[PDB]
């Protein structure tokens, strides 16, 4: 390839302007959207502009790259990248090579090129700015700069890896910029060298750019338009891999990376480190081509498609109201009343206050409801000292909450959220003394995790407005809300809770009433598979290693100690009674025997002070040594990949059941609900995406998943048999 073009062409994105001094201004303004994006239209547009910059080289003295959108440039074309098959590797490689040829020609024109960064410059947007010789950013609110490609399972393939390594060296570029896709405000970007100077308003950008060009030509004629790595004598910060200082610590870079990822199978960080170090061993142009090959391997791989499916398509179908009832207007929410002080009730009050709602915190007594407001109080006692004080807004937030201890203060409430002890008789009561004091149109929301919403509804007179609203602790940080429809819950009540969820900046999923709902039911199979393996004699250390290497945020035995094993015993008893009441019989899970053996030994979790781990001074300090004698650890030694797949497949199969039973109505809710609600590993794209994106010895796809599940079923049990819906 040797062209600035890749392949009714797309419409032009860049406007050309040459002023009287010979300075050409390239303004990026994609007419097909509100954001400049690295799509086919941009590539053809920049190709034309760069062709012209070379053709008119004798009348051009400098270049300014600007944007006419609210942002500078953000993101790539995910619709295209998600379709790239392994047979399209050549096309993907040719595309990024074409993009970087354009940027390389711009960079080696023989004259200064300034980037006028008016707003967000993310991904390919910052890669455009890094190909310029000078970067001016407007220090306006909301502006971000960074290379977040890794968060979608990709890498900065338009030169971002090569250029940041040349600018900052291998260690600083990888740790602080590339490996986590960190986003920087314009002030912090100037401090670390990502940006060179700041201006207060966007209107000063292009004038400041043309002025710097004028001064660079006067004061630095020989170096004008020459990047530092294109000069003789360039020294890479931190040294090259062949430098003795860097060679001493370089072998520890992959091992520290494995330590952070805990052995999880995310290929993007490994590829970024490989491209960075390999690129630092050769000239810039060779380094750039190496970067393209690692980019193509990520795009044509499956993990990138999982993460693009979840964090781009699925999360935007949800925010666009895919599960919201159709044809229902909005209804204002004036006062919100929480029926409970505690870790749940307090967190709900804060997230409602910050969204712009007045909250009334009721409890059994005002001295207990004061402790509830004390949780939001300590949350503000932290936010203040971290340089994040909203001042009057924070005080108004805490002022919004008002403890009481009597039903009389719920007078103007049109949105109730109870958070009290799990007891129908209690819940049926605490809604009775509040049902008539609230507004006639008020929504009666319950934050239960076990009790059926349809059964709780019978305790109120307006059952069309009774609905489940399930939060996750800590409420201020957990971004998912699980909305549960009772049998008599109306579409209007569902739509209003949906709007409330978006208003407080959280993500809703809509679940139909069923034992365990979605999140608690699916995470139960994850925990129960681990406890089964412990009862089968598998080493506890192998079980925790399998959880971490599968990609879970917490290994499953550690999670059991924090869910409290007594609470796991209660969920087992309740599931029994209910199954027996409707005439059925309950096949007990092998985990229940493990749960009971731990309780009778006085080891029931972290609050108790002793569980599967030992606890000293509150902190976790190693597995309990008596665990191996109790369960005959070592008597069973299955391969680690079998333990990993047993935990992932158990959750993926339970998710498919929920979709078949109508508990969930979309795979978007399943994927986002599993990732954000219970911590299903993001590399999978969700417990539902894991089926179409499975990859192993059997191959890749739904059929490979079916084959592997049957393989697991033969070895470990029929709970791994794939459902009819997954078969051809």
């Amino acid at each position: 390839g040797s062209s600035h073009h890749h392949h009714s062409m797309p419409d032009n994105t860049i406007q050309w302007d040459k002023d009287a001094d010979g300075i050409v201004t390239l303004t990026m303004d994609d007419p097909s959207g509100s954001t400049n994006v690295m799509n086919e239209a941009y590539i053809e547009s920049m190709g034309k502009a760069v062709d012209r910059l070379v053709a008119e080289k004798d009348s051009i003295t400098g270049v300014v790259v600007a944007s006419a959108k609210k942002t500078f440039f953000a993101g790539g074309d995910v619709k295209t990248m998600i379709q790239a098959r392994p047979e399209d590797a050549g096309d993907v490689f040719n595309t990024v090579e074409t993009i970087k040829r354009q940027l390389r020609t711009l960079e080696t024109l023989g004259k200064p090129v300034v980037a006028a960064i008016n707003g967000a410059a993310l991904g390919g947007g910052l890669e455009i700015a890094l190909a310029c010789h000078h970067r001016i950013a407007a220090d306006v609110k909301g502006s971000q700069l960074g290379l977040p490609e890794v968060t979608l399972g990709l890498l900065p393939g338009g030169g971002g890896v090569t250029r940041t390594v040349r600018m900052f060296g291998i260690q600083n570029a990888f740790v602080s910029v590339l490996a986590q896709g960190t986003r920087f405000k314009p002030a912090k970007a100037k401090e670390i060298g990502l940006v060179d100077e700041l201006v207060a308003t966007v209107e000063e950008l292009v004038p400041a750019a043309k002025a710097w060009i004028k001064e660079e030509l006067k004061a630095n004629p020989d170096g004008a338009g020459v990047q530092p790595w294109d000069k003789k004598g360039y020294k890479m910060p931190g040294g090259t891999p062949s430098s003795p200082g860097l060679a001493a610590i370089l072998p520890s870079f992959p091992s520290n990376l494995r330590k952070q990822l805990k052995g999880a199978p995310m290929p993007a960080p490994r590829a970024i480190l490989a491209a960075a170090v390999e690129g630092a061993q050769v000239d810039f142009d060779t380094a750039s081509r190496i970067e393209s090959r690692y980019f193509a391997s990520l795009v044509t791989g499956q993990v990138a498609k999982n993460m693009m499916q979840a964090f781009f398509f699925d999360l935007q179908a949800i925010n666009a109201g895919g599960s919201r009832p159709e044809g229902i207007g909005k209804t204002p929410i004036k006062r919100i009343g929480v029926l409970g002080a505690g870790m749940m009730g307090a967190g709900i009050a804060y997230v409602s206050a910050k969204a712009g709602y007045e909250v009334v915190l009721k409890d059994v007594s005002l001295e207990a409801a004061a402790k509830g407001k004390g949780y939001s109080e300590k949350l503000e006692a932290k936010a203040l000292e971290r340089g994040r004080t909203t001042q009057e807004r924070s005080d108004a937030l805490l002022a919004r909450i008002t403890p009481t201890a009597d039903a009389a203060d719920f007078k103007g409430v049109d949105f109730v959220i109870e958070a009290v002890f799990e007891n129908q008789e209690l819940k049926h009561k605490v809604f009775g003394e509040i049902e008539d004091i609230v507004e006639p149109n008020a929504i009666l929301g319950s934050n239960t995790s076990t009790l059926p919403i349809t059964g709780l509804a019978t305790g109120v007179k307006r059952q069309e407005d009774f609905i489940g609203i399930h939060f996750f602790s800590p409420v201020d940080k957990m971004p998912l809300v699980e909305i549960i429809k009772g049998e008599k819950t109306s579409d209007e009540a569902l739509a209003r809770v949906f709007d409330y969820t978006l208003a407080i900046g959280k993500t809703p999923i809509v679940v139909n009433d069923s034992r365990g709902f979605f999140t608690s039911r699916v995470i139960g199979t994850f925990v129960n598979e681990a406890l089964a393996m412990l009862g089968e004699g598998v080493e506890p250390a192998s079980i925790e290693q399998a959880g971490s290497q599968a990609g879970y945020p917490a290994p499953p035995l550690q999670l059991s100690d924090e869910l409290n094993l007594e609470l796991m015993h209660k969920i087992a008893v309740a599931t029994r009674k209910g199954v027996e009441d409707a005439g059925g019989t309950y096949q007990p899970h092998p985990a229940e025997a493990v749960v009971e053996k731990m309780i009778e030994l006085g080891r029931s979790g972290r609050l108790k002070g002793a569980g599967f781990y030992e606890y000293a001074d509150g902190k976790r300090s190693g597995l309990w040594p008596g665990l191996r004698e109790t369960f005959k650890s070592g008597s069973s030694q299955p391969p680690l990949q079998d333990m990993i797949d047993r935990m992932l497949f158990a959750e993926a199969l339970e998710t498919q059941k929920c979709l078949d039973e109508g508990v969930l109505t979309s795979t978007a809710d399943a994927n986002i609900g599993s990732i954000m609600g219970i911590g299903f590993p993001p590399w999978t794209g969700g417990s539902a995406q894991f089926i179409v994106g499975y990859s192993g010895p059997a191959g890749t796809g739904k059929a490979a998943f079916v084959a592997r599940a049957r393989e697991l079923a033969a070895a470990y049990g029929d709970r791994f048999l794939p459902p009819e819906s997954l078969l051809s």
Binding site: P241, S242, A247, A248, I249, L250, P251, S252, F253, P254, S255, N256, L257, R258, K259, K262, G263, R270, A271, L273, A274, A276, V277, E278, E539, P540, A541, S542, Q545, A546, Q549, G622, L623, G634, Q637, L640
Partner: protein
């Protein structure tokens, strides 16, 4: 067809890493000195019969670069037809050079070959040559690279070797090295290093601490020098050895091999070559074998290689009089003894690298010559020599006294 015989086996004393006597001596001079010693012992040997010089060297860079074996041929004034080849198989390079020499003789296409190794770790530190397994991230990540000391700590953790167990073996190594020196066991094979004027530079193994006590070994701190002090390697090791919860770090500078300078030379030939030059054979190379094990634990190669060479020779453990295993780490020797049920009085009877040092490329030839002398001194029949290797490899050799 042709049998390979050992006619000479000599070595320099081992100089220590810090303020060591051999720091001022080019590694090329260490080899040339041993060549001159061979000439002194056989001043009428026709060196034109010598067809190759094979030297192991793990860091062939700088002073040790450019085929140092050929440099030794030219600098010592050996015939230009004597060849010269450098090879690297990590810790077993010295024994691999001897085994390759023996196999060249057995093939019938060579008659008399010099083999050995040289390593000046004070002038060319370990890792000076770089490498892919460590410095290339894509393959480092895939093979799960872990430093040797952490694999040795993992062995002690898995096998149940306490800190006192590895320190007890280290004390025993110091005692047997001191007894061998004071008893004159090394007088015939350790060639003192001398300068261009004939002045003495070194005549003993500087790294030894004969007054080592169990209390002194207990005061030492676990290893924290170099790559191991960097982070992540413990977690990488446990990601593969997932049934182990925590690694017990028992190895220190007092129960691990010493970093030293040294060289060794072995003269190997056929029966006809020895008869022609009036050489008396000291031992016969019975069999050789190369095998390996897991490269993350990295030090368990000795056991399969030892079984393989016993099977190829038709022998069992009971047929062997002396076992010589390089003392890279105390836990490696204790694992080897436990796996094969080696009797204590047969294993490393003259002390090992913990007391005297481990000059990477030369060690294999050094401990082989040690066994040639100890067989002749005891009037014993067979010895088995083996070393653990980086990358999880293993080399083993059986010699028979003649």
């Amino acid at each position: 067809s042709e049998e390979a015989f050992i006619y000479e086996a000599i070595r320099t004393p081992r100089g220590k890493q810090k303020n060591g006597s051999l720091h001022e001596v080019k590694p090329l001079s260490l080899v040339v000195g041993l060549i001159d010693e061979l000439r002194k012992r056989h001043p009428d040997l026709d060196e034109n019969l010598i067809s190759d010089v094979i030297l192991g060297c793990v860091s062939p860079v700088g002073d040790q670069g450019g085929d140092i074996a050929r440099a030794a041929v030219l600098a010592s004034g050996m015939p230009v037809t004597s060849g010269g080849v450098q090879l690297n198989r990590f810790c077993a390079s010295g024994l691999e050079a001897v085994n390759t020499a023996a196999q060249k003789v057995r093939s019938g296409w060579d008659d008399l070959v010099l083999a050995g190794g040289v390593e000046s770790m004070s002038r060319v530190p370990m890792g000076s040559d770089g490498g892919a397994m460590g410095l290339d991230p894509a393959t480092n990540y895939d093979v799960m690279f872990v430093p040797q000391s952490i694999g040795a700590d993992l062995i002690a953790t898995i096998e149940g070797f306490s800190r006192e167990d590895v320190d007890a073996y280290a004390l025993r190594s110091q005692q047997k090295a001191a007894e061998a020196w004071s008893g004159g066991y090394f007088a015939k094979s350790v060639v003192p290093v001398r300068d261009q004027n004939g002045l003495l530079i070194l005549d003993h193994d500087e790294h030894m601490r004969p007054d080592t006590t169990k209390e002194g070994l207990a005061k030492l701190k676990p290893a924290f020098e170099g790559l191991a002090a960097l982070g992540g390697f413990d977690d990488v090791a446990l990601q593969k050895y997932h049934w182990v919860e925590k690694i017990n770090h028992v190895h220190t500078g007092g129960n691990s091999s010493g970093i030293v300078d040294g060289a060794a030379l072995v003269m190997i030939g056929s029966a006809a070559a020895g008869k022609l030059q009036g050489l008396t054979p000291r031992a016969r190379i019975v069999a050789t074998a190369t095998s390996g094990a897991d490269p993350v634990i990295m030090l368990t190669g000795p056991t399969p290689a030892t079984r393989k060479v016993l099977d190829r020779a038709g022998l069992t453990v009971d047929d062997i009089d002396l076992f010589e295993l390089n003392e890279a780490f105390a836990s490696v020797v204790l694992k080897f003894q436990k796996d094969l049920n080696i009797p204590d009085e047969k294993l490393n009877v003259n002390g090992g690298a913990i007391a005297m040092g481990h000059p990477l490329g030369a060690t294999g030839a050094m401990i082989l010559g040690t066994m040639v002398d100890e067989l002749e001194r005891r009037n014993a029949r067979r010895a088995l020599i083996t070393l653990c290797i980086g990358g999880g490899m293993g080399v083993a050799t059986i010699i028979e006294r003649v």
